[PDB]
Design a protein around this ligand. Structure first.
Ligand SMILES: CC1(C)Cc2cccc(C(N)=O)c2O1
Length: 266
């Protein structure tokens, strides 16, 4: 049974468990009383084990928690806020994202409507998030709009960074199971694509074939209504040669400038 860690422990009774948010494991909205230090309530997401869950399940949850502990805080990832480890089930508590994941965020604002500059900023923020994770030697393995969540203030937060997704894998990860900062940049390219199709499905019509088509040099076409600059960036992200993809560091610099030049009025 679990060891306490005073750094993160929040007494169980400071948590008012509200409605479910998603579900291997359930996630509930919750209000947490006195998280900073007192009589303030803060809305949060509380991760816990499903009813019939084996010791496999538990162990991973602890791992995720333990991992978030080590990675630390960034504006653009879903942060750890605390946990209830003593005297009842494990509850891991993380920042709450009121607007949901980016896929559904974007789909719901197809013609509410997101400007040109918002769509680039969305990209910048996720890049930053991954830039941070990358600096902390974190390798995501499943970066995608489904796994980026959006808060009440429209701040993009990478999620699940501490745990058909094939359509998001770089080919070397797909074939030889090699994941890296570079394969995560591949995944970012597909995510840039999801952004500027407002949540489009990748490789529509292609059965999972796709192994070979990627080997033959198949790349998604540019979305209707995406600049060529941003299509090239997707294309750079999808380099056949991993060492030849840009890094998140450079991606951030590029999106930064691009954001600055992008029309708010469009
Ligand atoms: C743990 C997780 C990434 C899963 C999940 C589902 C639904 C909402 C949230 C959230 N943190 O707001 C959430 O955080």
């Amino acid at each position: 049974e679990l060891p306490e860690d005073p750094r993160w422990e929040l007494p169980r009774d400071r948590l008012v468990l509200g409605k479910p948010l998603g579900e291997f494991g359930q996630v509930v909205l919750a209000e947490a009383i006195g998280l900073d230090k007192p009589n303030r309530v803060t809305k949060v997401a509380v991760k816990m084990l499903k009813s019939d869950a084996t010791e496999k399940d538990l162990s991973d949850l602890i791992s995720e928690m333990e991992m978030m502990k080590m990675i630390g805080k960034h504006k653009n990832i879903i942060n750890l806020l605390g946990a209830c480890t003593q005297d009842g089930p494990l509850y891991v508590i993380v920042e709450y994202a009121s607007k949901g994941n980016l896929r559904e965020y974007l789909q719901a604002r197809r013609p509410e409507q997101l400007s040109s500059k918002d769509l680039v900023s969305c990209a910048y923020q996720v890049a930053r998030g991954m830039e941070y994770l990358a600096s902390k030697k974190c390798i995501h393995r499943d970066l995608a709009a489904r796994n980026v969540l959006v808060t009440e203030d429209n701040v993009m937060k990478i999620a699940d960074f501490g745990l058909l997704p094939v359509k998001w894998m770089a080919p070397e990860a797909l074939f030889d199971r090699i994941y890296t900062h570079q394969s995560d940049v591949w995944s970012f390219g597909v995510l840039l694509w999801e952004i500027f199709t407002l949540g489009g499905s990748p490789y529509p019509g292609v059965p999972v074939e796709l192994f070979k088509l990627l080997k033959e040099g198949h790349r998604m076409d540019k979305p209707s209504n995406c600049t060529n600059e941003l299509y090239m960036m997707m294309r750079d992200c999808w380099h056949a040669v991993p060492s030849q993809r840009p890094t998140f560091k450079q991606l951030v610099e590029d999106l930064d400038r691009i954001v600055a030049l992008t029309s708010n009025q469009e």
